[PDB]
Amino acid sequence: ESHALKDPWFVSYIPQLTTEIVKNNYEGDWNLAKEALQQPLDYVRTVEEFWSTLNSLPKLHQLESSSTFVFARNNVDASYEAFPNGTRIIVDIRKAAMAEKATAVILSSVIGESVSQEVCGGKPICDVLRLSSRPNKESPELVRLEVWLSDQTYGKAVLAYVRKALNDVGMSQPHVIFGESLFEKEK
Ligand SMILES: [Ca+2]
Ligand SMILES: [Cl-]
Ligand SMILES: [Mg+2]
Structure with missing residues (x-):
């Protein structure tokens, strides 16, 4: 007796890319780069x-x-x-020592529709999740989780919800850091 997800999620992995590499090889199109370079893992249902x-x-x-x-x-x-x-x-x-549990909390909150239900009025807003190793000199084991929202007006509220979710199970600054980045600004 499996339990269906509200939506299926396609899971894949991509190599590390840069703006310049995507400009020069994939016409500036990050989705084309993903299609060209990803390897599938599963379509989870x-x-x-x-x-x-x-x-x-x-x-x-x-x-x-x-x-x-x-x-x-x-x-x-x-x-x-x-x-x-x-x-x-x-x-x-x-x-x-917190990365696996943080990942589980964030991914399950979105894929299990808690964010949609509790923050977004039951509308699907969070449509992409990404997970990467991103070491730096300050933080050599840093893992970066991203939650991509189709509607920026929900960003602050989603951040607050995910922060509270992590805080509630033992994960707060300085072990985890939160930010928001509008796509229009980054681009
Ligand atoms: Ca396509
Ligand atoms: Cl915090
Ligand atoms: Mg399968």
Whole structure:
């Protein structure tokens, strides 16, 4: 007795890219780069499949992979340009011993529709989730989680909800950092 997800999520991994590499090889189109370079993992359709696929991922906090893992609702295009008026919520997890649980909390909150129900009036707004290793000199095991929203007017409220969710299960500054980045600004 599987439990269906509200929507299926297409899960893949992509190599690390840069604006210049995408400009020079993929006509500036990050979605084309993704289509050209991704490897599929699964199209998750049930709660059980979600957990199976998540548990199969590399330990990004142990530098097992340089790839970005993407979860895309209904296989939506995962480029900024496919999110007009959108924003990204960034969650940086500095503490390696918290990365797996933070990832589980954030991904399950969205894929299980808690964010939609509790923040967005039941409308699907969070349509892409990304997960990457992003070490820096201050934080050599940093994992970066991104939540991409189709409508920037929900950004502050989604951030607050996800922050509270993490705080409630033991994860707060300085172990995790939150930010928001409008797609129109970044572009
Ligand atoms: Ca296509
Ligand atoms: Cl915090
Ligand atoms: Mg499958």
